[PDB]
């Protein structure tokens, strides 16, 4: 199952060209108007660059520490090499793109759901030719403009899913309760949460698993408090422990 | 078994040098009118590039990102090490030829079937002398004008035969008869032939345009045997003179 | 045996200075007025290389790919290190010569019979000091001019030196016979063939050690092509196939 959240290992990463006319950037996840560039050897991508721009006058106070600004950005140069098929089609589409020279759209297909789209013109074209090792062609595009990361199409919701089961209820010496934290608003989220008790004296909180475990190491009416996010939205859980 | 759809391991690979006239973009398949470079240690062929040509101005709003499009191409700087064997013709021939600034066309014959050629003059010449392994002559060409990758020849109908009708004819002094040849396996070939006697002197031959002409010299039976491109296909026809 | 046609070892390779007063150039192959420096540890001969000259001029129709011509030639550096004796005279004409700063020729010979001479002054004199290691000592030669290759000396013949015996006789099926190709004029002959049958399916042809295999696939009476270099001569052989 793709996770958008957690690292992902890389493997099964695909290449796609637009061949198309509508906006590559609108509908990247549809492959209809897109041939492939299968048998990727291997594939880096464009480093998006920016560089430094003076922002120091003469009249400033003090100049012991230099003062710099972003100045113009560039969406680098994405370069891969794959198994040489001239008779496959795609390839020669390839080979056709560097020869009129024009800027096209391209994409990465990552094993995530995510694909981060660019535009750019053929700058290089190559070849490996050694025996006992499949010959392979290298590219490299020099990209233009600004390219659609994968984090421009990442959406997040802000519902107030808030909700909090305590446990309202005795525990004895030596053992620990559980609470638990609704975090579904409508089920998706993207916030964390921290809970911590009140005095840390008469019961110890350990958060963990998305659930809440108090533990009554001495007797008495304690409170734990629950903040969720960025103080936007919190929690009061009453926990009793008894003499025994 | 020669598939350009699947990749191929590379070993194989053979390099030609254009020693005849014509148009050497034509006809790259055959092998006629080409010399071959032979023991070839390593093989490294030209990369196609293009520099960046700036696309901006004062009046474009927003310069954020920067804008490019591509410029001149200059495909360039094939080299391949070869065992150094100064008594064969081809390698006299590859110091001639870099002797002058003349720019020779040369082709490379891959395991697939294909061929890439290029059109350039050799700009260095190298050895390499250590005892025990061979010497090498290391070999640098500079590519000019514009190549012709495999990627543009997507046809190739293989041609698999033709026939060679003679004329049969007596062929009296001074007068020259016609024999008829055949390249139409269902029409599309792209392949050609070539006719050499086996005696020249009882009769001359004319190749020119897919026509041939016997000439009777002297009086007998001659013997004309034509073979296509590399070999693979060949024919053998007769010719009578008289003397009277 | 010397032989210039095929790849050499590289060991036995020497290196001799001229102290004459004659051509250096006119008869390398003699040893007489040349000193050798003996004891050569490694050897580096020079590379020519030639600069590129751009041949663009703005009325040029399109200036999509660069257009260069061969430019000036250079005859590069010969660096070698041999073992230090200072007192050994060789090396101090090897001083004398870098003290006095002219332009001497040198020359080395290969195990090969080719001898390829260069001219030039001394640019480097380098000395490696260590322990457990013979003192080394360094030249660099800076050559001036066009040089002498060894590709310069190679002669061809081509005194037409022809000949072909076949079998002219029955071959049953199952077996094969043999066909002779003699390429002496006079012995010498710097050219190749390509000999291949007329149907390849009464009969086929396997051209190999200099001789010709004709396997009697079908009974029949089956034509036998030769051509011999770039079509300059030719033979017809007639081979008859049994029904047996």
Same mark, same amino acid.
């Given at each position: 199952?793709?996770?958008?959240?957690?690292?992902?290992?890389?493997?099964?990463?695909?290449?796609?060209?637009?061949?198309?006319?509508?906006?590559?950037?609108?509908?990247?996840?549809?492959?209809?108007?897109?041939?492939?560039?299968?048998?990727?050897?291997?594939?880096?991508?464009?480093?998006?660059?920016?560089?430094?721009?003076?922002?120091?006058?003469?009249?400033?106070?003090?100049?012991?520490?230099?003062?710099?600004?972003?100045?113009?950005?560039?969406?680098?140069?994405?370069?891969?090499?794959?198994?040489?098929?001239?008779?496959?089609?795609?390839?020669?589409?390839?080979?056709?793109?560097?020869?009129?020279?024009?800027?096209?759209?391209?994409?990465?297909?990552?094993?995530?759901?995510?694909?981060?789209?660019?535009?750019?013109?053929?700058?290089?074209?190559?070849?490996?030719?050694?025996?006992?090792?499949?010959?392979?062609?290298?590219?490299?595009?020099?990209?233009?403009?600004?390219?659609?990361?994968?984090?421009?199409?990442?959406?997040?919701?802000? %519902?107030?899913?808030?909700?909090? /089961?305590? &446990?309202?209820? =005795? !525990?004895?010496?030596?053992?620990? $309760?559980?609470?638990? +934290? @609704?975090?579904?608003?409508?089920?998706?989220?993207?916030?964390?949460?921290? %809970?911590?008790?009140?005095?840390? /004296?008469? &019961?110890?909180? =350990? !958060?963990?698993?998305?659930?809440? $475990?108090?533990?009554? +190491? @001495?007797?008495?009416?304690?409170?734990?408090?629950?903040?969720?996010?960025?103080?936007?939205?919190?929690?009061?859980?009453?926990?009793?422990?008894?003499?025994?």
């Amino acid at each position: 199952v793709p996770n958008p959240t957690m690292p992902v290992k890389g493997a099964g990463t695909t290449l796609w060209v637009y061949k198309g006319s509508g906006d590559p950037y609108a509908n990247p996840l549809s492959d209809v108007d897109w041939s492939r560039l299968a048998k990727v050897k291997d594939l880096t991508p464009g480093e998006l660059t920016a560089e430094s721009y003076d922002d120091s006058y003469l009249d400033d106070e003090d100049a012991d520490w230099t003062a710099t600004g972003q100045g113009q950005k560039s969406a680098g140069d994405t370069s891969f090499t794959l198994a040489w098929m001239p008779g496959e089609q795609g390839q020669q589409a390839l080979l056709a793109w560097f020869n009129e020279g024009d800027t096209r759209a391209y994409k990465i297909r990552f094993p995530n759901g995510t694909v981060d789209v660019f535009r750019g013109w053929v700058s290089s074209i190559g070849k490996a030719v050694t025996a006992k090792e499949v010959i392979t062609r290298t590219v490299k595009v020099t990209n233009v403009g600004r390219p659609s990361m994968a984090e421009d199409r990442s959406t997040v919701t802000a %519902a107030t899913g808030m909700t909090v /089961t305590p &446990a309202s209820t =005795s !525990v004895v010496k030596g053992q620990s $309760t559980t609470l638990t +934290v @609704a975090f579904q608003p409508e089920g998706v989220t993207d916030k964390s949460f921290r %809970a911590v008790s009140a005095d840390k /004296t008469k &019961a110890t909180v =350990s !958060v963990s698993g998305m659930t809440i $475990t108090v533990n009554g +190491v @001495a007797a008495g009416k304690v409170n734990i408090p629950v903040v969720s996010g960025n103080g936007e939205f919190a929690a009061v859980a009453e926990i009793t422990v008894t003499a025994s």
